[PDB]
Amino acid sequence: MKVVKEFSVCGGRLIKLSHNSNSTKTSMNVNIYLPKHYYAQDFPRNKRIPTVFYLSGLTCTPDNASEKAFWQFQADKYGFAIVFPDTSPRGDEVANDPEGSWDFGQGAGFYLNATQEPYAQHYQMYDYIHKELPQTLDSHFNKLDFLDNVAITGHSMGGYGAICGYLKGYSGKRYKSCSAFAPIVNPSNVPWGQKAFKGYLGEWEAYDPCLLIKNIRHVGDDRILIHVGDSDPFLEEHLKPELLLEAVKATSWQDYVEIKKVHGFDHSYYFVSTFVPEHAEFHARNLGLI
Amino acid sequence: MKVVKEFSVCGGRLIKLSHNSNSTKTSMNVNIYLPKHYYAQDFPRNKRIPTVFYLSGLTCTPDNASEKAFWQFQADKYGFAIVFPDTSPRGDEVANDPEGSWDFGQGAGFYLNATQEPYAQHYQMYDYIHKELPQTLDSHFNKLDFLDNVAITGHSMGGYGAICGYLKGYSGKRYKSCSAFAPIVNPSNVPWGQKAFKGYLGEWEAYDPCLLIKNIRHVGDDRILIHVGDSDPFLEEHLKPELLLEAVKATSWQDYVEIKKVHGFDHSYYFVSTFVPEHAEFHARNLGLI
Amino acid sequence: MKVVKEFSVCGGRLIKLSHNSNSTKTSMNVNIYLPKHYYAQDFPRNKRIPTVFYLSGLTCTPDNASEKAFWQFQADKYGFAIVFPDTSPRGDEVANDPEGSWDFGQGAGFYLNATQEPYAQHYQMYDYIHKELPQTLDSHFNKLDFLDNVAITGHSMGGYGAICGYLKGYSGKRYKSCSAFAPIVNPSNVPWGQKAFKGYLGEWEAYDPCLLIKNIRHVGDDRILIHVGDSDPFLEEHLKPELLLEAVKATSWQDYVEIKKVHGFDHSYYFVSTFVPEHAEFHARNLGLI
Amino acid sequence: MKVVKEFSVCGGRLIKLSHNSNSTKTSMNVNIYLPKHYYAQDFPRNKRIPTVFYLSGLTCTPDNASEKAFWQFQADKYGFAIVFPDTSPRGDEVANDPEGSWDFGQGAGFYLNATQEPYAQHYQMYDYIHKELPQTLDSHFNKLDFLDNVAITGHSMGGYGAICGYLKGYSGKRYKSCSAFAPIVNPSNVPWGQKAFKGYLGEWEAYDPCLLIKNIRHVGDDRILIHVGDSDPFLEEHLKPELLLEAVKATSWQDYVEIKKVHGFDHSYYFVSTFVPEHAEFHARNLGLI
Secondary structure, three states, rough: EEEOOOOOOOEEEEEEEEEEOOOOOOOOEEEEOOOOOOOOOOOOOOOOEEEEEEEEEOOOOOHHHHOOOOHHHHHHHHHOEEEEEEOOOOOOOOOOOOOOOOOOOOOOOOEEEOOHHHHHHEEEEHHHHHHHHHOOOOOOOOOEEEOOOOEEOOOOHHHHHHOOOOOOOOOOOOOEEEOOOOOOOOOOOOOOOOOOOHOOOOOOOOHHHHHHHOOOOOOOOOOEEEOOOOOOOOOOOOOOOHHHOOOOOOOOOOOOOEEEOOOOOOOHHHHHHHHHHHHHHHHHHHHHHO | OOEEEEEEEOOOEEEEEEEOOOOOEEEEEEEEEEOOOOOOOOOOHHHHHOOOEEEOOOOOOOOHHHHHHHHHHHHHHHHOOOEEEEEOOOOOOOOOOOOOOOOOOOOOOOOEOOOOOOOOOOHHHHHHHHHHHHHHHHHHHHHEOOOOEEEEEEOOOHHHHHHHHHHOOOOOOOEEEEEEEEEOOOOOOOOHHHHHHHOOOOOOOOOOOOOOOOOOOOHHHHHHHHHOOOOOOOHHHHHOOHHHHHOOOOOOOOOOOEEEEOOOOOOOOHHHHHHHHHHHHHHHHHHOOO | EEEEEEEEEEEEEEEEEEHHHEEOEEEEEEEEEEOOOOOOOOOOOOOOOOOOEEEEOOOOOOHHHHHHHHHHHHHEEEEEEEEOOOOOOOOOOOOOOOOOOOOOOOOOOOOOOOOOOOOOOOOEEEEEHHHHHHHHHHHHHEEHHHHHHHOEEEEOOHHHHHHHHHHHHHHHHOOOEEEEEEOOOOOOHHHHHHHHHHOOOOOOOOHHHHHHHHOOOOOOOOOEEEEEEOOHHHHHHOOOHHHHHHOOOOOOOOOOOEEEEEOOOOOOOOHHHHHHHHHHHHHHHOOOOO | EEEEEEEEEEOEEEEEEEEEEOOOOEEEEEEEEEEOOOOOOOOOOOOOEEEEEEOOOOOHHHHHHHOOOOOOHHHHHOOEEEEOOOOOOEEEEEOOOOOOOOOOOOOOOOOOOOOOHHOOOOOOHHHHHHHHHHHHHHHOOOOOOOOOEEEEEOOOOHHHHHHHHHHHOHOOOOEEEEEOOOOOOOOOHHHHHHHHHHHHOOOOOHHHHHHHHHHHHOOOOOOOOEEOOOOOOOOOOOOOOOOHHHHHHHOOOOOOOEEEEEOOOOOHHHHHHHHHHHHHHHHHHHHHOO
C-alpha cells in the first residue's frame, strides 16, 4: 500500500491509498478514515479500534461517500475506523460494458466473482473485499482490527454487497454487524441484478440474499438494519425490500430485518448522510463501543 | 422563483430553485435548506427565524457546499435556514475568460459589480447577493427572515465576499455575524483578486477588507471568526489572512478579528465540514438562537 | 430555419443550421454544403443542382462527416449540394437510454418513427429525414433541388437508413440513387437493430432492407453501391452485409447490389473519406451530372 | 518506438506511434502517413521518399490534422510521407498553466526549449521536433528520409514553429521548403506569444521570425508560402502576418514571403483542408517530386 494523499478531517484523518491487487490484477484505490482514537496517547490495551466497511453503489468511487456521507463525525464519536473501497477493477485493460452502460461495466462489479472470460480476468470483487483488502490493510497498518470484529454496510449495489457478505459469513460470524441504505435485496428478479448475473456469471443462488437467507439458521438477537426513502426513484423497479421481507417470513430470520421506510427521502447522499448517525450507533453497539 | 427539485434532509428540506435575476439579467440557481423548525407545529415570535448566507469559492455551484459541508445538521441544531447562492452570471450568452481560465469568468464573479463593458453586462454579483436575492426569497416565502437578522459566511472567494459585504454594510448592521473559511482577505496583492480587479473593474479601494477596515468604526464586542488550515495549498500566495491581522493592528477593529490556523488542514471541504459546527454555533450566538 | 454559422470551404460554403422540427418537437441541427455552382453566376435552369443526403451513424452529430468525409471537394467537382442531418432528437426534454448506452437513445434514432410511448413523443426520425427536412430546406433556400432527383447515402446506422429509405420510396422514385458505407442491412438478427426495434416499436418487417427488398420489383439498371473494410471491428457481429446479398438472391434484385470488400479498411472516417470520391461519381452519373 | 493503431487510408496507411522521449522525459504520441509509394516495388534510388512535418496549433493532438486536413490524398498524388507531431509534453507529472488556460502549457508548447524550472523539465519541444523525433523516426523505419530532403509546415502556433525552425536551420539547409496556414509570425507583440515567452523563457530574440529573418542571407529562389483567411477571428490580435512583410522590406528576403489573404475563410480545418492541395504542390516541387 502507498499513501496517495492524506486529508485532515474532524479529529483524525482520511487517507487515500492504492495497492496492486492480486485478485483484481490491477491497481485499486481505497480510502480509509482513521479516528481521533488513533493518534491518541494511551493504549496498552492494544490493536482494537473496530472497522466498518462501506461498499458504494453503481458509478461510485471511494470519494463519493467519503465526501458526502460524513461518517468521520460518527467514527470520532464512537471510536471506529471506516474503509471505503472502490466499486470495480477499473482500467484500460479491464473489460467494460459492450454498450457503454453505467449499470454494468467498470464502476459496477456488483461484488461478485465473475466466471465469464471477458470479465473473469479482473472482476473478482467478492474476493477483493472479503479476503484481500482486509489482509492488505492489516498488513499496511499492523491498533486496528480489520479482521475480527468488523461491521459491513453499503448503499444500493453497495447495500446489496453488504447484506450479501454478512449472510455468507454468518455461520462463522464474519461480520459482527450489518446495515444497508437503499439495497438491491433480490438481484435475480431486478433489472440491474439479472444483468450483472447474466454478464458476470453463466446462464445465482449463492450471491442472492433472498435465496441465501433460507438456508441460514438465525442466532440470538442479530438483526439487519435497513433504511430506504419512499421518494427513491429506483424503489419500485430496482430495490424491492418487501421481497426480502417475504423471504424472511416464516423463517428463523423473521422479525430480524427491519426496513424503516421514512417519508420524503431520496436515493441521494442527502438520504444516506441523514441516517448515517443512527447507523453509526447501531454498529457501535454491535462492535462493542456502547 | 421556481422549484427544480425538493429533497428531504435531516429534519427539514433542501430546495433547488431557479429565478430570473434583474441584477444579472440572466437566470440563476440557488439552494436553500429550511430547518426542522419550519414544518413543525407552531412557534410565535418565530418570524425571527434567522438565515445564514453562505458564499462559495472559484468554480463552485450551489451544490458543492450543499452536499459537502453538512450545514443542515447544524441548521436543525440551532434553528436557522441556510442559503447557497451561485458564483457568477453563467450562460452561453454570458462572457467568460479569454484564455479559458477557471480563475476568471463564469464561476468566478468575485462578488463585485462589473464596470468593464464585456463583463458589466451580467456580472452584478454584489448587487445580486446583497440586494436582489434576499428580497426575491422573502417574496417567495413570505416566517423566514432574509432581511433583518442574518449572518454571512463563505469559503475562499466566498470568504472574501463574506468579510467584504459585512464590513461594507457594517454601519447599517446589514449582517449580524460574519465568518469565513480560508478567505482571500486582501485581493489587492494577490493574483486571483488582482485579475478580477483588473478584468471586472478598471486600471479597488472598496471591495478590499485590508483597506476598508482601517477606516470603519468598530462596535462593542463584534468580531470576525476565521479558520484556515496550514496545509492549505493556496495559503501562502492567494489568501494571506495575516495581512488582516496587520491591517487591523492599531485600529478600533484590532483584537476583534480572529484567525485560527489549525495544524494539518486543507482548503478542501474536508476542512470546511470539520469547522462548520463551530462556525454554526458562532452564528447561533449572534443570531439569538442560543 | 436559422443560420448558426457559415464557413467557406473549397469553392462553396458549409452552413450549420437549426430549426424547430414538427416531427421532433425539438430544435434540430443540420449542416449543408453549397458548392461553387451556387454563387457561380449564370445558367437559367437553376433547380438543376441535385442534393445528396448523408445519414450518419450512432453517436454522430452533423459535424463529424462534414469535417472528415471531404465531401465538399466532390460536391464542387460535380455540382451537387450535400446535406448532413442529425442522428436523433436532442435535449433533456427528450428521453434517453435507461442505462446510458451510446447504443440506443439520443444519437441513435435509427431513422425510425417510434411508437413505444416514452420515445414516440420525439423520435419521428423516419418522417424527419424523408418528409419534413426536405420541404424545410426547400422553403428556406428557394435553384436547389431537395425533393425531386436527389441521392441518399449513409455510414453504418446511416447506411441502413439510406438503403431503407431508397427501397421504401423506390416504387415512387423517391431517390434517384443510393449507396452505403459499412451499413447495417439486416436490423433484425443484429444487436443494435434488435434493440432499436424492441425499444422504438413494439414486440418490424417494414424498415428492414432484407425483408422489404423481396417485395420490390427491380427496374432498369438501378443499383446499390456498398463499400466496407474487411478490418471493420463490427463487421461480423453488427453489420453482416452478406445478408443483403443472400436476400437479393432469388429476387429480381439479383446482380444489382454490389458489396466491395476492400482489404485493410476500418469503420472509421479514414475508410469513409477514402471511398467518398468513388461514391460521389456513382451519384453524379445517376443524378445526370456527368 | 511502437505501433498503437494502424489503418488504411487512400492507398497507404496512417500509423499512430508512441515512444519514450528523452527531450520530454515523457511518452509522446506521433502520427505518420505512409503513401501508396511505400508498400510498392523495388527502386534502386528508393531511399528518396521525402517527408513533410506538420506542426499543429493550440490544444491540438496529432489526430486533428490527420482527420481533418486530408493530406493523405496529396501524399499519394505526389509521393511523400507526412508526420504529425504532438504539441506538448503531456502528463500528470508534467507542468501545466497555473490558471488552467488553454493557451499555455500542454497543448501549448510553442515549439520552444523552455528554461524556466517548472516547465524546463519536459518542455524541450524545439529539440523534440527538430532533432529527437526525426532521428527516432529514421531509426525506427530505416526508403524514407526524415532528416535530409524534408519540408516543414504548420497551422497557427504550428505555422509559427514551421516558419521559425525553417529560418533557424537555413544556414544548414535544415529544411528544403516551408509554408504555413495562418501563422503567428511575431510572437513578441502578440498575447499568446508573450505569455509563451515569459513562461518558458526569462527576460525571445532567437525565436522570433520577424527578428530572425533580418539576419539571414537569402539564397536562390527560396520563398515562404502562407495562407490566412480574412475571416480568421484571431487575425487582428494574434496572427499578424503583415508584420513579417515589414521585417522583410529593405532585406534580402523581400519578395520571397507571399501571404495569400483568401476571402471569407475561417481559422478552422475547412480553411486548412481547402488549401492543403496547393501547399502539397509547393512542397512536392521543392522536394523534387515534380
